[model samples]
Target chain A: NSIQIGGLFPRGADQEYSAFRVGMVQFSTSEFRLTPHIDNLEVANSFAVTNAFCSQFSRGVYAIFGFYDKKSVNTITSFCGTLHVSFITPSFPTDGTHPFVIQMRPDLKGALLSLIEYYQWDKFAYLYDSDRGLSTLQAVLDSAAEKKWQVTAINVGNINNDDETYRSLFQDLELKKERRVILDCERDKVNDIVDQVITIGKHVKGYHYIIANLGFTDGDLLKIQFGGANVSGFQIVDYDDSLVSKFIERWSTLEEKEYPGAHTATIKYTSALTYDAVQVMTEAFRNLRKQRIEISGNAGDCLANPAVPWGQGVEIERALKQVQVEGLSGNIKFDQNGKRINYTINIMELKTNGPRKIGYWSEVDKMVVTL
Target chain B: IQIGGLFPRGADQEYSAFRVGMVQFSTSEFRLTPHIDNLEVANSFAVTNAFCSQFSRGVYAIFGFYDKKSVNTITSFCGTLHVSFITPSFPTDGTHPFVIQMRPDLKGALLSLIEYYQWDKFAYLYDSDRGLSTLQAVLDSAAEKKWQVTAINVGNINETYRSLFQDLELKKERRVILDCERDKVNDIVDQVITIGKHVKGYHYIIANLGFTDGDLLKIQFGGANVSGFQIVDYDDSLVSKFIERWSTLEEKEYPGAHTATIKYTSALTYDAVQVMTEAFRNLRKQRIEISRGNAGDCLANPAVPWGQGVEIERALKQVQVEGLSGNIKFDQNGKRINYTINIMELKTNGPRKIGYWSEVDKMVVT
Candidate 1:
């Protein structure tokens, strides 16, 4: 036990394991805006992450970066940082031999209709977070109006001061007047907002509330009080350990211990997007290996070279179309728009105790294009 | 024996007497009125001859109508002849004087006459005009009685004669006669040639025909070398003349000696009436000596009481005289029940010489 570093050194191993060390560099919305952090995360950090994850392979490293919110122009620009990557570069506009990019928008209207139909509500009020949530809420309300359902009121609450706005919005909509309300917001604010609406609508008989964005704590609070208010929420779980078990049996490990923590984790677009990213990098490395292009320096240096800026979102997107991977989740293939074509969005019931997975609300084909 | 005298003067002379007589009876009038359309009378007479012949017994007299209408009716009568020759002696003809007396209905009378007479060896000369049911009934009766009958359709003489000859040969029976129309006699002769020389004693009971066309029958009979041939007529008036004329015409048409017995019922009826009148006259003459109690008994007396004079002598000598039309005499029931069956040979000359042979001397009557 004298400072023995497990998986730190190269030893004789199988040829397949010696092919390449693959890495997944996942960027949060915050770290993606900084100068060095953005560059480092997109390139250097991608290389370091690959080495750390693939060190057990005793192979050279290859980096891949997972960029979330890439569908938003602002988020894409912020993630790109000062890279100034061009579409004409070999890696950027890589021949016809590039992975296809696909972006998807969940069918909010269909989800809301499902939620409303499930609860048998005659009339409902929609509570929306002021910024990002308002548009989705507005889309659902407009579609509901076209379907001729009555909207008692719409509650617009600011996400920054969501507590105050939630209280005011509930009071303004006269929540006590309607028993059923649909709350649409980010995961962090959904629980407090639901609590405010329920408290205000307590006098109303059958005060059922549906939260569109679900959080672990919010789901717990809903389960705790579900019987009285008929609370429910929808959550999109990622292709994590549980989903991997559901979709692919080969990923199961005998040594791994089972826990509920894997299921409670929120699925960012980056979770699947990053899985696609790793597959693309592995394929590029495999092609390079077949071409006998020896990678120079460490994996970090290989990723930073502009000619081989494999972590850049455009290259990553291009490579995704050509890469086919049967992972822990499912057989993943990207369409031309870099969108996940195989995904399931589940509608769940949240009680006072725990969230119960009910049924799927949206599927890959059911995804709408909002833009 | 008195040769030409009208009377036999003594008892021995009476035993050596020859007599001939003739009386006229209208066959049409009698058949249409009292005889149930003449069918029963014809069937009765034919059947009686058939039965007697079948049992190898002889009839004193047997008569039938040679109805001048068409041969179909007369041929039907001969169908009864076939039925008669196949059965046993019937009860009706045992003691009853009339051949068909026991039968109550016309059909029954015809059937009973057939049963009583047993006339089995015959052939039917059918025409297309004959009804299927009528022919079927005749065939059924023939089959039931087991009579050897060759039902030939005279429409196709060649085929029909061949079939008839085959049927008759197959039965291996003789004394075969044809019940055909007068016109088909030539073809029937032609068919006879093909029938070869095995058959003999072939007779013909023709309907509504005269002896002038008799050569047609004669030639076929002679050509086939048949013996003891006969023909019946319904009337008797210059029959030998007609027979001569027929022989001449047939020889002129198709030359050869075709000798046959040409006879008729008209002559038979005349004789029968003549006998009845004689019986009546004899009965009247003995009225003072015998008790005139039963009319039937007086009529049936065994002996003639009156002197056998010219009238009686004429009546009995030619009892079945070949009159102008080749008929003979009857027994009772107003039916002509006598026939003069003769035999003749065909000489190189086309004409047939009469009295060449005689097969029967007296008519058969039951």
Candidate 2:
């Protein structure tokens, strides 16, 4: 039976959209033809999001999958729960529990906090951007109190300022003799901040900086490594996994004209999670077919007084929570609350050679260091 | 035509205070009767339904309490319909159009308080349940002020206060800012006393508006400094006069208002009603039309425009009065401004106002 799904994404998310296309082609079969209705818009615009969601709702999609920023995520979260339509996204999970929503990205807070403990660095300067969020930074500070660590958290959110602004910020940190620092920001902002560090002669030995994000392997850390500065981060995509190795080989040979950044050396964790989320959704549909459950489209209208509640939406959501599979982003599973569980994040440290996986952190094993 | 109140059940004080506000504000022809709906504030769907129900009832504005989870839903609807929502809760992450925030943002005052005490180093004992905004503020300020901060999440430890206090003892950190619930504050204070740490040289700043919310005065601090912020200054003549009427009011008429003391939330609720009444009065004075229009079906992207809805919202933003909370006013963005919070300090007698913080002047000794 042919099935329809919705894909809501931001306008500039090309890599994730490319990976999503790959997953659709890889997962589609003769017996099950999956057609996706896609719409791209600015995630910050609530009105645009509402209109796009209503358009998708009227198209009778079984599940709506997309990415949303922290501010606009609640818009889709509430609508999905109100209509009983499943929403699968790669966005970071929120604290509040909302039904019929599945978060594919692994909860990195635990692994990140555990890795910090393993490093035995009790005192450090936490440089963070508020645009990403305060939860992770708050987690670090909360742990600092329990571990008796003195943390100086600095907001690097002033991106519009001149280079002198960053220079002065670093000057203050340097005057305070702050050598241990943690960089919790976007991937590109990380590069910019590190470049300023190199410009001002702060990227030298004894100055250890930890990049607390999932895309440790996605960006360039080699240039910073050459300065002999100790850099550490967490990576979710395991290149050693057989599925990831095969996917990387295929991703490397893609047409660069059609799929921009497809031939890059590494895939961003967001793209990998998007690929995994699509595969997980397909697996859930496959499981439903095995159970001989009849699935139908829901033509719920946004303009209707009482929107048509999808009958099989909750069942599809249940199936999604039960489907456990391994994809490009490693083990994909969810708790009852739709939080990702039982996932492993590889810990990497910048070496003279390159970013090397010296250890790994998981929910069960905590943090295991080999070197 | 009417004001709607969406409160959690057993919020009797705020409910009765709302009634008091209506009874106090007289109108010859334009009277605002309130309809209340009590439901679980955490349920997003239920909150949405309750709001939509109120919207369909032709409520001019909604005055109620919303938890962090359900606040977003109400805010979205309020903004979409141009219906005003006057609330005493902390403002949402950013400004939402048409929502009148009654509580003043305390981040500025808090930073000033820390600066006044000259505490360059302190432990921020924050309850995660209460949220991380205040903690985030302190951490952000620590960077600017070159302060070394140690923040801890004191939520959901199953009352293992002994261990948490011992951890603080091990660090030798005496200056602490307790940002937790009123009950949790009492629990933490009792634990400090139980462990014999509530002695001289220890300073604690309770980070909340209700200085007298708990049994704080009953416990002896043994000269350990305790300070906090209270928005409702009972010592003020304006507040004392209102308290006199509230204390002598009929208990049967108003369930929770016959009392000498009032919580800040109840006081703010009363102020919110007065603010709304004054806004409507302003609209009438300007000869603006007051019409009731049913909010179309919520799912249909209802735009209830009421024609006068925006006018009422503008009036609310422009309204200024001295109510239970001092200098009740709002900026153009509907955020409370020009307000005052009494800086209270514990003495051998009891907690007394040592100073006050305001939007313009900041912290000043009384």
Candidate 3:
């Protein structure tokens, strides 16, 4: 009658982990009382991760919701693949496909390509964080080469090299006078790169920069947008949307110390996804109740090799992935491989007062700019 | 023995040194047949395929370079397919079961260096938002240490940096910790160096290891006490031999030869090879064989029956080397442990080792 679910976050993944706890409490239904088990992972330790998964598995949980960094993802992939347990993550723009794993964040390649087309700029610099070995960029990269677009790829934010290298990399980009640039990095890296661009005296009227981080507009990025060089980016959650406004209304009332830097004004991309992930899971659990497809397991510890795999694992996974509902992240749907699909992102540009929503790009509309 | 190398184009410095390491490791007794692939993270499919091909080729293990983008893909494949991956790349975040991290933890070394300097208050100037994570440890201890720390994001936000530094030059805020990418470190220094003021007695720590590449010469004569930590110790006998052989390599492939000095990335890469080579040899000696698993799709594949990946990972951790890196060892997480970092301070004559820090011993002074 009741559902037990688990959540995992590494030591320093403080923000996402807290939002996950809030989502669980706010969305639990009476019929399906969702019991929660949360685990804090040591950064990059496989022993700790596997033990956490086993503890949850031993609890006979229906699913696990957690963020997987580069260090901890392998264990999740192998464990979930072997057990056929569903694991949903609300961080990173990941592609390709692993079984029983749902990447809540949508791929930026299509939206990025659409934005480039809208600008109609033939040449630009692509400053991507070298840490993400993304195949999602594969299609966009192939498309660029085939179309003869000039894409200068630079990997910044990696500290393996020295400041002399960091300076030259930017100076080289400036030397080429690359007016249009697409930066693919996380939120924190956004300002420093822009600072370097300005420090190099590239903040003049002709320069233009497009940031690819979803949190670009929702964070301190506005500080750098003051200069005349046109700065633009995309946001997954439109604060203007009613669903988000309503969520932020309650979210703002949470204790200030607990939610530092979180306000009605800015909803983190991970927070929005965390909320939606809960709603999506709730809807699917209720739908399973209607179908009378009960998921069952023996009550025993996984370390003791007590409970066997649930026969309904595949069906539960199917229901979890295919189930559709409207929530914070807009249209909720997934491909056969469990990648989030058909989501719309708002394209924003910074102006004198604040950021303005200049256009919109969705799977259906591609790019629609009224301005 | 056949081995694989994943030295992508973006990692020119690491890749070049890895090649020099590969050539340096090759001898009459043990020859290495290397298959190197230039991977672009955007082409994720290609990276997966490259690893699969190397796995099929029956290479002992892969000695490679990793950037943030490709490490997840590379490490995931290595663990699932039962391959060993070693890299000089700094893993500031994330850990994988099969990958050997050669770079001594930067955050740990920084904390040790700060404590050794015995500073109570300083301004923290970092380039990006990501720098906060790098400086998190220092922030955690500041309150207890009775320290007054002023941290700023010099990211052209408001140029609060200019005024902040001006006040710092009030002559009292001499203690500073600079934890940023190389460019920001230099640009900040360039500003102070240009000011023609605040030139003496101001103790600043250049957190980037590139400080050794003769860059310290910029501030050595300036009378400011600049201190930092380096994992690669060229003063040792091992480095003397490494540099001797490194210079003889193909200059086009080895960037180390292009310069009189070798960068930290190269030293780590060369050390990575010696670790894997010794691990492979010991695994074979211990009556264990490198088992192969089916890489079915390569594009969307994940391995075991021939399940010796665990054993090889243990063997890698068991590897002991007295080479480019000192008294090498790995902890439970495959992180380098008990490794030594040479602490250098900018002297008027040049740079000299003021002390050393080890994971076993927190910090030491000569």
Candidate 4:
């Protein structure tokens, strides 16, 4: 018996697309020859994205992968929910209550709140770029009153370098003599603010800045490597782990000519999550087979025809959520919300010498400072 | 005319400034009788008692000073009573009809100063969470102007603000803005210069209440362009006369007040009285009478719901005066409208008044 799965990736999303195929190859099982019918979606264009995804769904694949971009997110979200097909994604976080979509990336705010508490900071500035930046501002604020922490909420999302108003915010914060700060912005602007920190000369001895980005690395911190300030962050994909180490050993051997950018010795954070997503799905399918839960493939339209999902769709989703396995990224677990939770993140700090492992942050342990 | 005052007793230069205003008023042909009470500035209970006492004394207006903690209590009380309250340095987060803020808009002044320097990128060091309200305006303008700004909270005098300087050293952020009040500046300056951050390369714009005050002597010596906006023009003839008269007063009775180095709050308090006096004079000319309402506890009965509250508030909002703070005027909310701040910078020679910033005219080079 063959199990067909649908895979979607934006045309220029080379890393995600390549990793998706590589993940399929790595997780190939004996009981069911899992086949992926792949499609290149222009994730930004809604019409093209809806068409590509729906057409893939009409072919009656057991599950769908990669609802990544903001433009195409809602269209496939409700469509998948209405039809009961498990939507496995390494990109889109969660629909909050969507049953089928599996979010690979865990929430970063919990780890941040724990880190803030670990430092015993009653008050600090939260420099979030957009509303999405501080997903747990509620939780952060809930404990703030009891903790007696003064929160200076700053939206540094869309900035222009020449604006005096933007420049004086830094000026004003400096005047208030605030030593502790938080940066939660897009990955690019995270580095941009780092440029700003250097320009203001505040990233030195007495300052501790925490960048709340799950995918940030010490390698990206080279521009600020020499700075004596204790710049810290959290990483979900522990490249140092043996599971990740062995995966890269074989992953690096893939031919660069066809795989293109697959020869890199270091696995990307998203690539690792993408690899783990496939593994999680594979394990869930294997568990469903053991439970005698059947996933059927019938050629029908998802739009007009009532596309029948595998009888195991609900059970497989349940199995996926409960499938506790350690892969290239880390421990995979989901809460009642369908978002990945209960995972550990490696706490990193950029010291005078270099960026090194200072501690670890988990849902249970919060932030454990090694240094 | 009777006026009420709430001044913090010891070490607060504001009480002295209020006394100076009384001294100046006595010399005037027509003077308003002021009933003053001294209390702890941080205590809300004492502050409220002071306000209630002034209300009972049949005072038409009130003059005072406030920090972050005591501001809301006084503002809400003044607004509810419809009692005109003229003040100096105020956190701009709140707006009250009765409270007359002598200081101009901080965000506008700082943004103009930033534009004057042409700093495409800079670091902001703010001390108070309340300060961020004004800082947010600059951040908003920074976004619009395409300026890159990094913000840091350095707490107060108690905080070291040390390691953050090292990161700034690594990044070579030469242009900086100190958004904190005067007291915290010295410690931050020590930490920054301790690392031997070249004062020559580093340009700092001090954005605060008394940013142009003499508190920033440490950084000025090294020749980094230390600049700030000063409301109290020490060079003005009226200030010189006020200082001369103040200087001759008995040192024992008015210890710090009679000194050469007068504090900003004191100067502001002095100007707040003058502005209020002028508003009363203006109201007297228009035959707009200020009548005391039904005698009730100020805490119990709010003046906002009374007949006299509206007219007194209107008079204060329309009050205009040329005093120590040049050409003071007020809008409906009692925020000083046509006010000016001296833009002072510390060069190798000394701190020199290079320009001036105002509400009507943005910034003018002297």
Candidate 5:
């Protein structure tokens, strides 16, 4: 007799396919939030995820996906040798625009394609420190091509004033009219270069600036000093200050000293990113172990298969793409490109003391859309 | 019998008893050739003659023959002692004034006799070797209790004045004596007369003056004015016929006076052999073994039957024993040790000569 099974199962089947039980491996630890400016967390998170994935796939397929800061890209590549690891580059805040979401989608799509194409995706670069701003421009260009969106102008500035080479290049590009340039350099140099930009703005009219480089407290002072009417259109790409303040308090206790200014923002971002990478990998592993599936072969395959009971990098990437975790920063997640899809860019005013957050970029469906 | 006076030339021969056998036992032959008129010998012989004149007194007899040209007389005393008489030779050519060299041979003989007999018991004495080389040797051999011997330079004219003071001090002390020569004796006497207030007691002075007269001694320190003095020499003229020869010199031409009372003894070895021979004869009569080595034993124990006592004194007083240079007795040490000594005093200074008077009262037994 033929039975019609609908909804949960199919009825008029000619042959019965047995369901394979797969197991899930959970890699979650206690939720830890960090300030954005803290160094080394991104590299630490990458290794933790790689180790978790490899352990879960002791007999089966496994995969890992994560994002790192531009400064930590080299370390992540070295640690992820021959593994199907995908990287998503985070975008700098420019002109109060939350560009990281759009940039991360294509990064995720490209990583997924390469992981399937090469059978093993070892390394990828989302945030690249290169002249000509090829990584940033490419992200914008790729986004424009994929979404059919138009990008106006992308302005890159030298946060380090003593970088005469970068300054000369900016000068040759004739950025005097636009004046709105995003600084991407170390903290100390960011302030000095922004001040020079403000100085240069005095001779030119309609000058605007934005600081994309993350710094400790000192950068806030520079933002305030260098952003105003004479230096109009200044914005800072930063994490939530409340979360940064909380993490900073705990960080200061551990360090036994008061962290300098602006550390809360940087450390919040770094801690959240590290904490998310570990969290997502753990959740995917736990899901894989729960399914009673054979994990003895092709863990990466299981993670890549849509119908499998437990999978890795793809599910972890899907979860990271969909879910927002309350990491060291506020709740945050990655986009399709594995870049941090959630960020708050605040339009700020420069005062004698520091930058005052006047307004934040609007959120579009739980993600910061624009200032 | 009168004591025969001394003679200088034939002293050895006379002291040998003029016997060939005695001469052979007593002496070797004289070495110098006896030239009849060798001027040097004649000159020396004359000087000896004048020095012998001090002995010519007390009716003494002459024993030995005389050398008229040299004016030396050789003689024996009594029956046994031998002597020589000598005079100062006058320089006839007048090239140099007459002077006498000290007779070293006679001086040596006298010293040997003094040492042998231990004649240190004499009153006044002096030794030239105190100022010469013998003082060092004498002091080395001398016993701690030995007698005081003085050294003086009697020949120095400047020292004449000090002699009387020294001599008088010696006279007062009586333990020490003056040892000097003839010139010093005159100096002492002249000093005594010139400074009579400083004169002291009678004292003796034994000397080897080799002069001929004791009269000059009397003229300066005579009578009760000065104490008696005695002099000793190998030349015997100071006690026998000494003034007889001095009278021949012209007045005002006589040399300075001899101011010591004269005393003379035979040459040291000359007398010692005389005594030794007597000792030997006695030993032979008693049939005692006698040899040169045991001769000292015979002399020390003279009372033995073959001992020297009976014969040695007789031999010493009478035998004219000859020696190396003259005749003398031998002591136990084989030394020419004399015992008998003649003493005389000064009497007067006449027209050309000084005269002596015999003082037998002052004589002592050896």
Candidate 6:
């Protein structure tokens, strides 16, 4: 028998979609198959997402996998909790944990702070983009207060994405003699800022930039070879690992017509997490079936009997939290709050050769281990 | 002095009302110029950027569209810079400095409506899109009244309410309070009819200021009891006069002005500009120089504050006008004060006002 699940993806999510297909193919068994009900739309459109979710709900999906924006996260969180359906997402963690949501992306706060401490950076500028970035910024500021770090935080969220504006903003920072800076915006913005730093003649030996993202080894930073400036970032996927090496091989060989973004040399952490999310969900489903628990898509109409909770939805959700596996990203696990736990983030520094893995930080160790 | 207008895209109604307000309240000597920006009001970044751009233009005050999410950023910037932000959006929690709230608080009226019905048990069907404070107020009062309240979120815009009605039917819940957007209220009512629940033994209290805002008249209520609150009373002679000009206005000049009826936000926006113009006139009478400031860089603080900024804010809060929204006034903290909401019920002849509710009088039946 086959089991039905849902996937809420944004438009142009080629990489994540390809990885999801990869996960589904790898985890499917001859006896049992995972049927996916995929929905693609603008992630910011909460109304569209609700319609898509309701469509899936009416079709009786047991669990849903997706990414979300700040505006639409609240809707999905509340819906999942209310209906007792499991929502496994690779999106950035919400401000706090809510029920029935399984987070796949590892929290980068521990790795980011450890990297800052390792570099002995006591004074720096923190530039953040959206409301989600506020969570990480607050953690850094809290550490700053205790360690007496002089952190000049600026909200660059409203900056017009133009060469003149970017140059002028960095010029203002240069005027303040801020040699060390943290770029914590979207992936495109990271490249944009670094390119601006190089354009403004600030990407020299003295200037140091920390890219606050897990997909450091991804192609976003590959184009910009930061001449002699010190650039550091966090990478969760160790390409040298055999599991990841095989994944890259399979991914590179995928048909671009079917999997649009799969022909890349390196995979993004988000896509890798998407693949891992499917793996986690499959394992949970398989585990439930092994324990003689019925895995059926019997989630009734959300409006009809919202009071009558899903019979198997809570069981599947509990099974998902109990899942542990080695994924393309790294060690995948979850705490009771559905937060990623006991994961490792590799620290990489830009060199003349390429991004060299120099160290790593783990959630359990809570400190950076240098090579 | 110039004024900034922050309106959401496709908000022709509010923008046209804003323009009408400036023209109607024009003074002989002092003039008010409006610099408008149409952008997504929900994006905090976009809103902040728009506000700074307007501030650089040296606007005396900004009249902005409302989003529950991004209003905080605007209010915070206004409070820090001593600039006045007049908005038609619902007032945020507590009070922030230099903000003039145009929307009246509806919690008191909603609770009073429940008490008037004297229902001990009912379902609270709310829309998350409208927000949670009003819903929280109802839940808090239910605890005090020892009432059984089954709060259900029926905020989904999609046409998927058959099951919801079926659930309600299964539960045998007869009394319900609907707290949602005006359009969604009509949808729910239609769904109730579709599920064959539109009959006697059911009462619905719509928690909104504009009960007649949508197409509730076209639908057949079929003897089911429906009641709500309305802020604008068309029965008033002043309102009728405004409606006459409003309906006859050219659609070419004002994209959204040819309508016979107006939304609560549009009317409040029209009222807001008048309040700002009155304050500016009062400031000019007191010989206060209505000079524009440089506003400086977004990062840097001004060397000297706008000397008359707080004066203009205080003047704005004190100024009162009987505009389209009726008895426009504000308290010390810039909260709407001394406002009246007309209690309305659906009749065979269409919806009619049965009573009225005010902050001081609570609820009064004529």
State the TM-score for model 2.
0.89
lDDT of 4 at A199: 67
Question: TM-scores across all candidates?
Answer: 0.32, 0.89, 0.54, 0.52, 0.28, 0.55
In candidate 2, position B341 carries an lDDT of 84
User: What is the per-residue lDDT of model 1 for residues A263-305, given as tens digits with 9 covering 90 to 100?
Assistant: 3323233233333344444464454445554433232321132
Interface RMSD values for the candidates, listed in order? Answer: 62.2, 3.3, 16.8, 21.8, 77.7, 20.1
Which ten contiguous residues of candidate 1 chain A have the minimum total lDDT? A86-95
- lDDT score, candidate 1, position A106: 29
List per-prediction Cα lDDT, in the order shown.
0.34, 0.79, 0.68, 0.68, 0.31, 0.78
- Over A1-371, each residue of candidate 3 has an lDDT whose tens digit, in order, gives 67888887666565565566677777766777777788887635443565677678877887888776545565666567656678887856454468888778877777778888888877776666634443433444444533545455544545554656556666666545677878777655666666666666645667788887676566667755336888888888878789878877877777757864354567778777887888777777777878998876464534232225567778778888887777777888988888887888888888877789888888774888865
Candidate 5: global Cα-lDDT? 0.31
What is the per-residue lDDT of model 4 for residues A1-371, given as tens digits with 9 covering 90 to 100? 78778888767666666777787888887777778888886664444554566677677777777755543455456556656677788764743477778888877766777788877887577677532422344345434533545566566664666646555666666755777778776666666655556666664566677887765562454554325566778777777889877877877788877786677766557777778888888888898888877776454544432334556567767877888788776888888656877788888777656557888887675677674
- Cα lDDT of model 1 by residue, B1-366, tens digit: 101011112211111111112213322222111111112222222222222232122111122232111122222322222111000011121121222211111122223323434667555454432122222334445434545444444554445456556655555544333334455655666566665555444544332223433554346453343322224332334544433543443433322322333223222233333343343244345552321111111111222222322223323332343343234343332223333333232335532423311112322321
lDDT of 2 by residue, B72-141 (tens): 6777678877779988887665668889998878778888999999999888777864445777778767
* Top model number, lDDT: 2
Give each model's clash number: 69, 0, 11, 66, 119, 2
- Cα miss at A120, model 1 (Å)? 5.6
Measured against the true two-chain complex, the DockQ scores of the candidates, in the order shown, are: 0.00, 0.34, 0.03, 0.02, 0.00, 0.02
Off by over 4 Å in 4: A1-371, B9-11, B27-31, B156-160, B197-199, B209-212, B218-223, B302-305
- lDDT ranking from best candidate downward: 2, 6, 4, 3, 1, 5
Candidate 1, residue B116: lDDT: 36
lDDT, candidate 4, B68-146, per-residue tens: 5456556656655667777775645445667778776777778888998888777777676443555567655654465
Q: Report the lDDT of model 4 for residue A358.
A: 80
Q: Alpha carbon lDDT of residue A149, candidate 5?
A: 28
Which digits, one per residue and each the tens of the lDDT, describe model 2 over residues A189-292? Answer: 67777776777774467678788888788855544432667888889998888888888898988987788668775788889988888888898999999998
Model 3 lDDT vs. the true structure? Answer: 0.68
